[PDB]
Amino acid sequence: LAPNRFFFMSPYRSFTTSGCFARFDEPAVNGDSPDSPFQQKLAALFADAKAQGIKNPVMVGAIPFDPRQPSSLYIPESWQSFSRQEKQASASLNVVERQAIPEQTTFEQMVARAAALTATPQVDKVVLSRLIDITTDAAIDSGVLLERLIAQNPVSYNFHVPLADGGVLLGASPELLLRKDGERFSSIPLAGSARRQPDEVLDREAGNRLLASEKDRHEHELVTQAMKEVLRERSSELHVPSSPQLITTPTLWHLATPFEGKANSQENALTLACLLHPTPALSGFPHQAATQVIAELEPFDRELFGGIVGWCDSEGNGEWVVTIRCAKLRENQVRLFAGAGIVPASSPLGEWRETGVKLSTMLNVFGL
Ligand SMILES: C=C(O[C@@H]1C=C(C(=O)O)C=C[C@H]1O)C(=O)O
Ligand SMILES: [Fe+3]
Ligand SMILES: [Fe+3]
Known part of the structure; x- marks a missing residue:
């Protein structure tokens, strides 16, 4: 896959893009x-795109x-659908510098100050x-990391996004x-996690301890x-289970509603994705305070x-997933990301290890 191409894999709509008609920084x-x-x-912009020949223009980024x-949005020249099922089946790195930003002690102290504030x-x-910031000695083939990423995460929302700086946004998100x-x-x-x-039996048990965890359920x-409220004002039917269910990734259990x-x-x-975003899974509650x-x-x-990554088309359809389990690569440099929601029951070392398991997904992709 050319690094100048948008790739989105989803049970809903999986497609690639070619070209670039108009970028959108608004x-x-x-x-x-x-x-x-x-x-x-x-x-x-959609109107301009149709006027200039683009059939069924779509906004990705x-x-x-x-x-x-x-x-970091743009309308490509064309887009190509593919079967997610099919893709699910058909699928050196010298290091020069490695740094955690921040390192273990500073992060645990950050969690501790935040758990005190909450x-x-x-x-x-x-x-x-x-x-985790990583420099390598060469340019990274984002097309091959992607094939590795899908193999290791054949079920998540996997994305590969070209960026206006010659980089790529790459990740296997589990959060729609x-x-x-x-x-x-x-x-x-x-929201809420537990190592698989x-x-x-340890696995099934780990999943049960999660459903029983008072900390992870608060x-x-x-x-x-928070979302129940935001959406109550804008919906006509709205179904929200009073309790969560479990879902999985190759590294973690999560709680889902x-x-x-x-x-x-x-x-x-x-309009709806901008409404909810960022949810208290990513910023906190209340939003401004946590920000x-x-x-x-x-x-x-x-x-x-x-943030969020996905696509919106001329007719209002779309999908947007949280930009996590992801990495920004550019030429010979990489930057991974993992966050964690702090609450008064948060353990400084508990969260350090939790953000750690989350980084393991992109690290598994770079063979680290
Ligand atoms: C924001 C991140 O993940 C969120 C953190 C989780 C948690 O531990 O509560 C659950 C949902 C994730 O979307 C991240 O991995 O950086
Ligand atoms: Fe958590
Ligand atoms: Fe209904």
């Missing part, structure tokens, strides 16, 4: 309102964790994050933020209760990490 802030400069500029920042009224939850498929939309937030065990209800709703007349994939902690404590900027 920040997705206030993208939930149709009157917003984002939504207006988006319609004018990525939106950062903070949508006041520029977006014990207070002003904040109930915070998602802290860390990275917003699918729109007609007037009906779905959303399956995740190599034995199927971490979860905080997320679903599937959302199902019907959308008003003038919604689209993006102030993240800024007070994180010694980097997430940029595209913790």
Whole structure:
């Protein structure tokens, strides 16, 4: 796969893109309102795209964790569908520098300060994050990491996004933020985690301890209760189970609550994805408060990490997944990302190891 190509693998719509008609940097802030400069500029661009010959134009790309920042969206010249089933079956690296940002002690102290703050009224939850920055001696073939990534994660939402800087956004996300498929939309937030065990009894047991974990379930209800409210104002039918179910990835168990709703007349994939994003799985609760902690404590900027990646078409359909279990590569440099939701029951070392298991997915892709 050419690094200049968008790739999206999903049980819903799996396709690749070719070419580039128009890039779209407009920040997705206030993208939930149709009157917003984002939504207006988006319609004018689709219209311009049809006017200039592009059949069924589609918007693909990525939106950062903070949508006041520029977006990484673009309309390709064409797009190509493929079978996810079929793809599920048909699928050196010298190191020069390695650094954790931040390292173990600083991260545990970050969790500890945040878990202290969440014990207070002003904040109930915070998602802290860390990275691993890796330099290599050569240019990275993003096309081959992708084939490795799908093999190791044949079931998740796997994406490969060309970026305006010659880099790629690559990842196997398990969190669907917003699918729109007609007037009906779905959303399956995740929150709470447990390492899978190599034995199927330790595994099943690990999954049960998760469903019984009070810490990991408080971490979860905080997320679903926030979205239940946001979507109550904008839906007509809305089904939210009072409790979560379990799902899996090759490394982790997670807790999931599937959302199902019907959308008003003038919604689209993006108005709704910009509505929910970022959820308390990625920013925290309340949103601004947790965002102030993240800024007070994180010694980097997430940029595209913790954002959303996916696609929206001319007719309102689309899918958007959380930008996690992912990496930004560019020429000879790599940056991985893992965050974790802190609550008063959070263990400083517990979270360090949890963000660690999450990095293991992209590390498994780079054979590290
Ligand atoms: C934001 C991240 O993951 C989130 C963190 C999880 C948790 O431990 O509660 C569950 C859902 C994930 O979407 C990440 O991996 O960086
Ligand atoms: Fe967690
Ligand atoms: Fe119904």
